[PDB]
Symmetry: C2
Subunit: 251 residues, 2 copies
């Protein structure tokens, strides 16, 4: 299971900043055969970034996309559009959208199917809230989100999906889940996959941990058996740090 | 009041199709001082569109945007990013955003305040549902949406805002409101602006009609005293159709 590490810039840079970032990083990202390095930038910069990452191993991804090819959804961007640009990854179901922009597990599932239909590798986010963690439904929440999202896929496709387990209370809070704790939920997710798709799908899929990961702690997480890389937001905004993170995938 | 005509492509093209459209229309769109010709495109294409449209009376606008400059708002595009790119107009509160992605009058307000503080001209959308229509709250529903969306602005800036009345039921249904009716509602909205910001701003503010405006029915709408133009959706995808519309503004 090849490690994958994705940077979610969120709403954070200006085109110039964005291109300077790719320029700085693209030459020192680990080889593609070793670690999948992905920078999820805001829509406006995807175009220039896809080019700046000319023939580099630095992959470019979007922070969303709609579930339709084209249509009357003012503001949205389609999986067709993103593909045409050279974007290869797309974050789906991020809580920031689930709780703010009405992203239901239904829309997320639609989007995952669309992703595969259009050639994009989806990074499906799933995680519980503080309240759910405290109430004990962590495993249940995570399980439903994963069950629903992967609905409609074949095992061969599931092997290609990426699942980012991100406990909400850990996103940009400075409070990370522990490797051991995260490892279990991830093991649980992998176990849910196995029960729905099979031991091959489950043994292939790469599950990520997201939530206050830092270049000083990626190693700890990546070292765990069920975890295959980290979805990083805040610590991916600086080229250096990002290079630190992506190198954690044992170069 | 200089007529303004904006086209909302919604989720509709590929970068390539997008650039040729601009490449085809830009040099033939009406002279700025006569008609404000605008093309609202997907976030993905703006960089290039802005670049290719530089120097022409053809203005480029975004289909939506967030209210915060920076932020952990995965998938969102901020006013800073837009202005920084050269984008001049932005659509806010489109029914499609409203009923499908949790766009409320509060957030729409925050966004309107954001456009002004960030140097973007907002095309504030408002309109009644079929139900509210039948119940007779067209003037009410519409008045509230405008009062809420404009709250915070000074008369001086209200004079710069573009308000687009679109009876939800006419948006791409093929059925459009009668000029007389649309004019009545636009008038009423203007009364709202007059009452809130004084007659001066009310007379300078431009109010569009949206809801199945075809290149063959736009003149009818523009003719109406209270209607200063149209926000066209489907009829704005073809260079040929777009140029017809914008020309109806010329004279």
């Amino acid at each position: 299971r090849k490690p994958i590490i994705a940077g979610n810039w969120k709403m954070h840079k200006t085109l110039a900043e964005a291109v300077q970032f790719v320029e700085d990083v693209k030459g020192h990202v680990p080889p593609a055969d070793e670690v999948i390095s992905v920078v999820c930038a805001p829509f406006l910069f995807l175009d220039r970034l896809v080019q700046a990452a000319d023939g580099t191993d630095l992959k470019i991804g979007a922070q969303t996309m709609h579930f339709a090819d084209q249509g009357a959804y003012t503001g949205e961007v389609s999986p067709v559009m993103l593909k045409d640009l050279g974007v290869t990854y797309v974050i789906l179901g991020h809580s920031e959208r689930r709780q703010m922009f009405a992203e239901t597990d239904e829309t997320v599932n639609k989007k995952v199917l669309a992703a595969f239909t259009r050639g994009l590798i989806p990074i499906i986010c799933c995680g519980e809230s503080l309240e759910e963690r405290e109430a004990g439904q962590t495993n249940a929440v995570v399980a439903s989100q994963v069950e629903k999202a992967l609905a409609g896929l074949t095992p061969e496709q599931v092997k290609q999906a990426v699942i980012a387990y991100e406990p909400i209370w850990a996103i940009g809070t400075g409070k990370s889940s522990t490797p051991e704790d995260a490892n279990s939920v991830c093991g649980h997710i992998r176990s849910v996959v196995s029960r729905l798709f099979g031991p091959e799908a489950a043994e292939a899929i790469r599950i990520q941990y997201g939530g206050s990961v830092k270049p000083d702690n990626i190693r700890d997480f990546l070292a765990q058996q069920q975890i295959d890389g980290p979805l990083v937001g805040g610590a991916s905004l600086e080229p250096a740090s990002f290079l630190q993170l992506v190198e954690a995938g044992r170069h």
